Design a protein around this ligand. Structure first.
Ligand SMILES: *[C@@H]1O[C@H](CO)[C@@H](O[C@@H]2O[C@H](CO)[C@@H](O[C@@H]3O[C@H](CO[C@H]4O[C@H](CO)[C@@H](O)[C@H](O)[C@@H]4O)[C@@H](O)[C@H](O[C@H]4O[C@H](CO)[C@@H](O)[C@H](O)[C@@H]4O)[C@@H]3O)[C@H](O)[C@H]2NC(C)=O)[C@H](O)[C@H]1NC(C)=O
Ligand SMILES: *[C@@H]1O[C@H](CO)[C@@H](O[C@@H]2O[C@H](CO)[C@@H](O[C@@H]3O[C@H](CO)[C@@H](O)[C@H](O[C@H]4O[C@H](CO)[C@@H](O)[C@H](O)[C@@H]4O)[C@@H]3O)[C@H](O)[C@H]2NC(C)=O)[C@H](O)[C@H]1NC(C)=O
Ligand SMILES: *[C@@H]1O[C@H](CO)[C@@H](O[C@@H]2O[C@H](CO)[C@@H](O[C@@H]3O[C@H](CO[C@H]4O[C@H](CO)[C@@H](O)[C@H](O)[C@@H]4O)[C@@H](O)[C@H](O)[C@@H]3O)[C@H](O)[C@H]2NC(C)=O)[C@H](O)[C@H]1NC(C)=O
Ligand SMILES: *[C@@H]1O[C@H](CO)[C@@H](O[C@@H]2O[C@H](CO)[C@@H](O[C@@H]3O[C@H](CO)[C@@H](O)[C@H](O)[C@@H]3O)[C@H](O)[C@H]2NC(C)=O)[C@H](O)[C@H]1NC(C)=O
Ligand SMILES: *[C@@H]1O[C@H](CO)[C@@H](O[C@@H]2O[C@H](CO)[C@@H](O[C@@H]3O[C@H](CO)[C@@H](O)[C@H](O)[C@@H]3O)[C@H](O)[C@H]2NC(C)=O)[C@H](O)[C@H]1NC(C)=O
Ligand SMILES: *[C@@H]1O[C@H](CO)[C@@H](O[C@@H]2O[C@H](CO)[C@@H](O[C@@H]3O[C@H](CO)[C@@H](O)[C@H](O)[C@@H]3O)[C@H](O)[C@H]2NC(C)=O)[C@H](O)[C@H]1NC(C)=O
Ligand SMILES: *[C@@H]1O[C@H](CO)[C@@H](O[C@@H]2O[C@H](CO)[C@@H](O[C@@H]3O[C@H](CO)[C@@H](O)[C@H](O)[C@@H]3O)[C@H](O)[C@H]2NC(C)=O)[C@H](O)[C@H]1NC(C)=O
Ligand SMILES: *[C@@H]1O[C@H](CO)[C@@H](O[C@@H]2O[C@H](CO)[C@@H](O[C@@H]3O[C@H](CO)[C@@H](O)[C@H](O)[C@@H]3O)[C@H](O)[C@H]2NC(C)=O)[C@H](O)[C@H]1NC(C)=O
Ligand SMILES: *[C@@H]1O[C@H](CO)[C@@H](O[C@@H]2O[C@H](CO)[C@@H](O)[C@H](O)[C@H]2NC(C)=O)[C@H](O)[C@H]1NC(C)=O
Ligand SMILES: *[C@@H]1O[C@H](CO)[C@@H](O[C@@H]2O[C@H](CO)[C@@H](O)[C@H](O)[C@H]2NC(C)=O)[C@H](O)[C@H]1NC(C)=O
Ligand SMILES: *[C@@H]1O[C@H](CO)[C@@H](O)[C@H](O)[C@H]1NC(C)=O
Ligand SMILES: *[C@@H]1O[C@H](CO)[C@@H](O)[C@H](O)[C@H]1NC(C)=O
Ligand SMILES: *[C@@H]1O[C@H](CO)[C@@H](O)[C@H](O)[C@H]1NC(C)=O
Lengths: 598, 48, 582
């Protein structure tokens, strides 16, 4: 549905005004729904804004500030949901749009279809050249009145003689159409006329075309396939005639703003809803490849707060103060970020830099449910010795389109991740790593979960330059996944391996320890049995029953060094086997017969 | 214009950018150096 | 208050002598009738004033075979008709003939579903007068409306001031007020002819104003005096952060209304509603004292022991020799139990034997029935119901004839027994014709009931003074004179001690027989090794540790039969010491 993300900058901008305009296009050009805020700032009267005409809805606040152009082409903007407010008060804020020492600034607002704000106030205040800032019935637009709405050009006239103070422009097409304050007494919602017979449905937002829950220009609550609804179809229906709960046949997942028939694979299916993590009262489980959750009846594992989740909602980064919360963690619920301010401290705040030794609290983490954003790292941390045992990342939360973001890391020469095998979803962006050597030796379609994932690599250390006179891949490592120097930095080896270590041959017929093998993995056999010489195999598998030779007696199918006598007694000969003792042998045994008992 | 120099309590308000203080709304803001974004210019631009 | 109905159509009362007491206790003081409202076979001059409080009926309204001149339902505003008389009608008035004179349904303003029907009422005037299509609901319009004007009385004009001659009776106040067919707008109900007199989408029966707070009756659910589409869920889903969390405003759905919590006898479900059955793949868990809820099974659920009216037993008449084995060793039964003629007699047509006293032993482990217990036949060899002596709770979720949780009809019982019983969660108790039982008067009924609209009804059981005239009466040791039957084993609560099942006056501590240690209401023997001295600790306690006195071979922590073979031997004081030989 042409969904795009906002800039989230507030008043701050780039030093290059032309790049600021190009970026405004890159973010919002041809978009219909804005995620987070819609921020339109510092654009000169010499640049066209017609690419903003397709925007229908904004989840955050709409901010327009310090511009020089005459008209806002925001004619199709219908609804502002107010999930985030400017200065934590205002959902719409339009101010200071003019040059102090000239004749340039905003004159007309457009917005012909702007009907409602669900949360937050309105800020207008000073706009030197703006006509019709006043004479708007803001109580028909705001759904929650606060008896906010601050207004301060004059003598601009009226839209039309027929529009009785319901105007935000110079023509009859700029007249405010009242949908809440001009209604029947019986209405709970908004109307399409002044009668009880032309009032519309209760979930509908932004005006209506008819009385049906389908006939509506926006929805409160959920979209169920074009119907505005308070709740999606549930797996059960309550029967008030018999006090019974009956099973449904048309149930759907409650998911974001929508009702859907197929939950996203990376999300927990709870019984009728899809969520980024299961609540703390329930344990996350997997059945038949489906990620789901059940009541915590057993001793349940707990995930730790990530950046922007749990007790860290206000955190931008790991920092010298919140790094102490990750000490015993194996899973992080949320994102993992390292900004400049977190790593080198923030002198505006009481936060200090992080000592590289403090980073060791993450050496126990195997899963991160959000994305990895790395923009700063300590000057002498040349590889990721922390997180080397990290298994999987992302799937549920992404940074724009990315699950792994690595920007401008000058101190890094190798990555050295040993356990990182899969990325659940999202793309990869790695650039400006001028000293990083092994980035070209990875077959990334082996790490991606779907054929639709992509990676962008540019401006890092030249691969031919490093290979020729720098660092190269280990002789035993394959063409897929050679992340650093040595046999222990390779994700996929030829011949054999033992855990994280790659080897040319296994200890089957030589060494102070002996092993058995499969196609590429070797494991040690029970040492209580004998070691074979002259190239001969010592064991067929992990036990005294597999050992090919035994230096001691046996017990049934397997080699035994010491016989479990004195259980009941069960003696043994030194050459062949253990045997049961005579029934009278209660205080020692020398054999199976009557004279062997002590 | 609408802004002047940042008050002493904002010496470190902005990182990798030029700090300015908006007089009309009595509110600090920053002009970021090339390749930096965010309210304090605390992040790099992925489209650069 | 909230009350329920019988759902017995035109059948005869089980105990006509208590028929009016049953109706007065179930309905006196209640505003809402759950299920059908049935007022049948009422005698001449019945005191029906307790019915004046009924505002709303969930099922059909049936008035049949009554000799009463009037029935005080003038406040009844709405019939939901969710069950229909003969699967057709939401109101039925049948054979009331000296008979019913006037309907007097002043405030009746809604039939949502199902027809009206009227037949064979020779004394009932003004059938013909009411404009049924104003009372019907627009979206259903199910006005079958069969009528029978062939009355024996002559009707007077209903009122000098009723412009349409449409009335509920002979009074100037009986004139029908119209609420649908007289208004300019398209609204299902309105308060006046004007386009501004429409009151609301969710309101029914008309209104006192234009808001969902003004409704005289309410579609969907009443929440707290405002009329509403659904009761708010207990858990709310966050559409912006994709997470589920408890709802600060969350509520339970309960029949016609929305509540903060459900009544004592209802089973809570986490979806936001209260039911009488637990959804598939869930256990009934008593998480807190006085309540119960459903919880999901983490692995496949255990066997559920079902009774009559549930699953494969839904069409089964009674317990017989063909199905008695299904209850063998059950502690909780999901459903009801019925022991009728042809349960203890035979049924040659289906080749089924009668129940035997040995077969009744399957219920010895039973503690709870999630329904009713109905017994109308029993063996003559059993003077009591001791095969259920361990039954503790009767929930009443399913009631016999829609009203009774416990019913005993004409049995050969000499005393009730059932000493383990402590709760009758819901439903009435009916005891009558039981020609040889008498301890019904000593039972502490006020301790067993849990809700108002709940009572004992009884008649034709052997008279107290005629029966206690034989000295057959409750035991003096116990319970202020409350008993289940004869003797100190049929006591409710011992004033001194309980030994086994018997109330006892003495705790046998220092007597000639095997000496007992004391407990708060109980008495139990020393361990056999503890010496029966006359000192109150010596021999006495629940453990070896109290038995400081030893009869023989004393091991320092406790007296034992023999010193253990490290080998030990008895010394000069009878205590165990290590041997020189091992
Ligand atoms: C996760 O969070 C916990 C807090 O919940 C942190 O705190 C403890 O950290 C220690 C060290 O990592 C954990 O491990 C144990 O530490 C003992 C230290 O001695 C103290 O505790 C013992 C307990 O019996 C006392 O007798 C003693 O007087 C001290 O007060 C070690 O003794 C343990 O191992 C050694 O001793 C045992 C003795 O049987 C030997 O078997 C071992 O071979 C070895 O010689 C052990 O290392 C401790 O469990 C944590 N406590 C709790 C309550 O959880 C953790 O540090 C933190 N984890 C990480 C990774 O940061
Ligand atoms: C912004 O404001 C405008 C009005 O100021 C608002 O109206 C939309 O206009 C367009 C055309 O200009 C309508 O487009 C429809 O297109 C279909 C085919 O694609 C036609 O079949 C429609 O014809 C009829 O039915 C419509 C019923 O929705 C009528 O609106 C129309 O007059 C015809 O009788 C029609 O041309 C579009 O439907 C309307 N909007 C609606 C839903 O009425 C526009 O929607 C506003 N933008 C925003 C914020 O959505
Ligand atoms: C010693 O080394 C052996 C290999 O050299 C190990 O392998 C074998 O393990 C099985 C299972 O424990 C033993 O038992 C039987 O195996 C057969 C074969 O079925 C196999 O495949 C099916 C299908 O996947 C699988 O379900 C089984 O587990 C087996 O892996 C079965 O049909 C029988 O029912 C039975 O399970 C073998 O006897 C055993 N091989 C030997 C020793 O002969 C063996 O496990 C190693 N021992 C130790 C100490 O673990
Ligand atoms: C409720 O959800 C449904 C989808 O399940 C919404 O319907 C769809 O709305 C999208 C909005 O972008 C329409 O896409 C448009 O398609 C035209 C094709 O010519 C394209 O030019 C536009 O750029 C845009 O992509 C889509 O056609 C439409 N689908 C149908 C079948 O109508 C619906 O709008 C939602 N309702 C509300 C109130 O949110
Ligand atoms: C980089 O990794 C990709 C997988 O992400 C490797 O591509 C895969 O190669 C295998 C082996 O050839 C393909 O499987 C089978 O190949 C035979 C031909 O050898 C063919 O007859 C079978 O029908 C089957 O395709 C597999 O399809 C292919 N995957 C994809 C997505 O194309 C690739 O070889 C790796 N490159 C290096 C240098 O290791
Ligand atoms: C030689 O190959 C055998 C298999 O033929 C290896 O044993 C297998 O090890 C895998 C893990 O690498 C086991 O898979 C998983 O096991 C867990 C056990 O709880 C189960 O929950 C998972 O669903 C999955 O099955 C597999 O079961 C196991 N096979 C058997 C038969 O036990 C063996 O380790 C190899 N030896 C060497 C030296 O590498
Ligand atoms: C929603 O249900 C509530 C009850 O839960 C309804 O309110 C109840 O209205 C009755 C009258 O119809 C009240 O009873 C009367 O109270 C006065 C108190 O002085 C007494 O004099 C009368 O004899 C009679 O007992 C009752 O108190 C009241 N309950 C509450 C909780 O206020 C309400 O009408 C229902 N709303 C709809 C739209 O149906
Ligand atoms: C019948 O049942 C009640 C419980 O329903 C029995 O429990 C309670 O027992 C005590 C002792 O007999 C009664 O009196 C109080 O005893 C304590 C003993 O320390 C004393 O401190 C008090 O001053 C008082 O005397 C208590 O009232 C009673 N509670 C109730 C709820 O009745 C009772 O023992 C049984 N009675 C018979 C006659 O079986
Ligand atoms: C009311 O009584 C009349 C007769 O007084 C009944 O109408 C007759 O019904 C019989 C049914 O077999 C017909 O054969 C006659 O032709 C009818 N008579 C007339 C004059 O139409 C009527 O059925 C009774 N009403 C009810 C509801 O029982
Ligand atoms: C403690 O109880 C013992 C019995 O266990 C009493 O001893 C008995 O006393 C009678 C007195 O006539 C003798 O005939 C018996 O031979 C005694 N029995 C034993 C086993 O010695 C003793 O009197 C009791 N003590 C008190 C104070 O009552
Ligand atoms: C490594 O960086 C840390 C950062 O805290 C610093 O303290 C240390 O001096 C650095 N080491 C070297 C050798 O520069
Ligand atoms: C490799 O990189 C260094 C960077 O200083 C450069 O001087 C050298 O010429 C390069 N070598 C090759 C083989 O390109
Ligand atoms: C009903 O009361 C009237 C009062 O006049 C009386 O004549 C009649 O006998 C009464 N009926 C009964 C059954 O008591």
């Amino acid at each position: 549905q042409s969904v795009c993300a906002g800039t989230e900058n507030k008043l701050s901008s780039l030093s290059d005004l032309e790049q600021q305009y190009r970026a405004l296009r890159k973010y919002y050009e041809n978009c219909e729904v804005v995620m987070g805020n819609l921020e339109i700032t510092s654009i000169e009267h010499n640049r066209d804004l017609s690419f903003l005409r397709s925007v229908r809805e904004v989840t955050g606040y709409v901010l327009v500030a310090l511009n020089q152009f005459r008209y806002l082409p925001l004619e199709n903007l219908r609804i502002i949901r107010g999930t985030k407010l400017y200065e934590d008060r205002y959902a719409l804020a339009i101010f200071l749009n003019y040059r102090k020492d000239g004749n340039f600034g905003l004159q007309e607002l457009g917005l012909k279809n702007l009907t409602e704000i669900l949360n937050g106030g309105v800020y207008v205040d000073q706009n030197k050249f703006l006509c019709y800032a006043d004479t708007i019935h803001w109580q028909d637009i705001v759904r929650n009145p606060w008896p906010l709405t601050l207004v301060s050009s004059s003598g601009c006239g009226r839209c039309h003689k027929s529009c009785t103070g319901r105007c935000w422009g110079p023509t009859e097409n700029h007249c405010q159409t009242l949908t809440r304050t001009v209604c029947a007494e019986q209405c709970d919602g908004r109307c399409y006329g002044p009668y009880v017979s032309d009032c519309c449905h209760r979930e509908c937002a932004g005006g209506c075309s008819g009385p049906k829950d389908t006939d509506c220009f926006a929805c409160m609550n959920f979209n169920d396939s074009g119907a505005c609804v308070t709740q999606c179809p549930q797996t059960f229906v309550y029967n008030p005639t018999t006090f019974q709960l009956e099973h449904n046949f048309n149930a759907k997942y409650t998911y974001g703003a929508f009702c859907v028939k197929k939950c996203p694979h990376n999300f927990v299916v709870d019984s009728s809803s899809c969520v980024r993590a299961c609540p703390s009262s329930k344990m996350e489980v997997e059945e038949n490849g489906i990620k789901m959750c059940k009541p915590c009846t057993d001793i349940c594992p707990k995930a730790c707060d990530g950046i922007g989740t749990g007790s860290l909602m206000s955190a931008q980064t790991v920092d010298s103060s919140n790094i102490d919360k990750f000490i015993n963690c194996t899973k992080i619920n949320g994102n993992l970020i390292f900004l400049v301010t977190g790593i080198h401290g923030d002198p505006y705040n009481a936060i200090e830099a992080i000592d590289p030794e403090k980073l060791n609290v993450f050496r126990t983490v195997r899963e991160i449910t959000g994305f990895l954003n790395i923009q700063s790292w300590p000057p002498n941390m040349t590889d990721f010795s922390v997180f080397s045992n990290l298994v999987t990342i992302g799937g549920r939360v992404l940074y724009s389109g990315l699950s792994l973001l690595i920007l401008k890391q000058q101190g890094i020469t190798s990555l050295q991740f040993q356990s990182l095998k899969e990325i659940s979803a999202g793309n990869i962006y790695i650039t400006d790593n001028s000293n990083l050597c092994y980035y070209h030796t990875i077959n990334w379609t082996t790490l991606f979960s779907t054929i639709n994932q992509r990676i962008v690599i540019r401006d890092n250390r030249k691969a031919e330059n490093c290979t020729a006179e720098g660092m190269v891949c280990n002789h035993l490592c394959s063409s897929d996944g050679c992340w650093g120097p040595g046999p222990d930095q390779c994700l996929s080896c030829r011949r054999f391996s033992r855990g994280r270590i790659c080897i040319e041959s296994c200890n089957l017929y030589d060494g102070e320890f002996r092993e058995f093998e499969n196609g590429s993995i070797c494991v040690e056999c029970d040492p209580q049995c004998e070691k074979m010489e002259d190239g001969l195999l010592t064991c067929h598998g992990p036990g005294p029953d597999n050992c090919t030779k035994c230096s001691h007696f046996k017990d049934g199918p397997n080699c035994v060094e010491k016989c479990p006598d004195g259980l009941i007694f069960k003696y043994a000969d030194p050459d062949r086997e253990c045997h049961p003792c005579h029934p009278n042998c209660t205080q020692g045994c020398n054999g199976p017969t009557s004279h062997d008992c002590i | 214009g609408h802004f002047s120099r940042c008050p002493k309590q904002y010496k470190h308000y902005c990182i990798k950018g030029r700090c300015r203080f908006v007089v009309a709304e009595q509110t600090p803001s920053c002009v970021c150096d090339e390749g930096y974004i965010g309210a304090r210019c605390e992040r790099v631009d992925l489209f650069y | 208050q909230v009350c329920t109905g019988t759902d017995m159509k035109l059948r005869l009362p089980a105990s006509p002598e208590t028929h009016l007491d049953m109706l007065r206790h179930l309905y006196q003081g209640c505003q809402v009738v759950q299920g059908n409202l049935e007022l049948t076979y009422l005698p001449t001059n019945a005191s029906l004033s307790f019915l004046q409080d009924i505002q709303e009926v969930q099922g059909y309204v049936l008035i049949a075979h009554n000799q009463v001149r009037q029935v005080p339902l003038q406040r009844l505003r709405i019939v939901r008709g969710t069950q229909l008389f003969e699967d057709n009608y939401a109101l039925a008035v049948l054979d009331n003939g000296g008979g019913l004179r006037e309907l007097q349904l002043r405030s009746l303003t809604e039939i949502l579903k199902g027809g009206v029907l009227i037949q064979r009422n020779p004394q009932l005037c003004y059938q013909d007068t009411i404009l049924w299509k104003d009372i019907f609901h627009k979206n259903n319009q199910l006005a079958l409306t069969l009528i029978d004007t062939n009355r024996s009385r002559a009707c007077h004009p209903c009122s000098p001031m009723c412009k349409g001659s449409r009335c509920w009776g002979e009074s100037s106040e009986d004139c029908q007020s119209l609420t649908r067919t007289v208004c300019a707008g398209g609204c299902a109900r309105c308060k006046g002819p004007l386009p501004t007199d429409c009151c609301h989408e969710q309101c029914a029966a008309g209104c006192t104003g234009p808001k969902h707070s003004d409704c005289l009756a309410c579609l969907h659910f009443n929440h707290s005096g405002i009329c509403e589409l659904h009761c708010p869920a207990l858990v709310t889903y966050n559409t912006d952060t994709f997470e589920s969390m408890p709802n600060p405003e969350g509520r339970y759905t309960f029949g016609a209304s929305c509540v903060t919590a459900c009544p004592y006898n209802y089973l809570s479900t986490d979806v936001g509603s209260c039911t009488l059955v637990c959804p598939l793949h869930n256990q009934e868990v008593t998480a807190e004292d006085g309540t119960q809820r459903c919880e999901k099974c983490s692995k496949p659920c255990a066997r559920v022991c079902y009774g009559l009216g549930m699953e494969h037993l839904r069409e089964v008449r009674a317990v017989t020799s063909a199905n008695i084995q299904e209850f063998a060793g059950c502690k909780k039964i999901f459903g009801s139990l019925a022991f009728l003629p042809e349960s203890f007699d035979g049924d040659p047509a289906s080749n089924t034997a009668p129940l035997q006293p040995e077969q009744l032993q399957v219920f010895e482990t039973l503690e709870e029935i999630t329904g009713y217990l109905y017994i109308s036949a029993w063996p003559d060899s059993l003077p009591d119901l001791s095969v259920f002596q361990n039954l503790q709770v009767i929930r009443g979720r399913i009631l016999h004839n829609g009203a009774y949780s416990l019913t005993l009809q004409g049995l050969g019982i000499s005393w009730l027994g059932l000493r383990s019983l402590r709760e009758l969660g819901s439903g009435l108790a009916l005891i009558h014709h039981n020609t040889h039982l008498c301890f019904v008067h000593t039972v502490p009924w006020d301790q067993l009931f849990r809700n108002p609209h709940q009572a004992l009804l009884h008649t034709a059981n052997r008279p107290e003074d005629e029966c206690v005239g034989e000295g057959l009466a409750c035991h003096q040791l116990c319970a202020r004179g409350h008993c289940w039957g004869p003797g100190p084993t049929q006591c409710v609560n011992c004033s001194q001690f309980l030994r086994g099942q018997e109330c006892v006056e003495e705790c046998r501590v220092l007597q000639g027989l095997p000496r007992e240690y004391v407990n708060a209401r109980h008495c139990l023997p020393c361990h056999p090794e503890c010496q029966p001295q006359n000192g109150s600790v010596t021999c006495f306690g629940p453990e070896a540790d109290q038995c400081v006195a030893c009869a023989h071979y004393k091991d320092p922590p406790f007296c034992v039969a023999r010193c253990p073979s490290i080998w030990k031997f008895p010394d000069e004081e009878g205590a165990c010491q290590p041997c020189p030989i091992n």
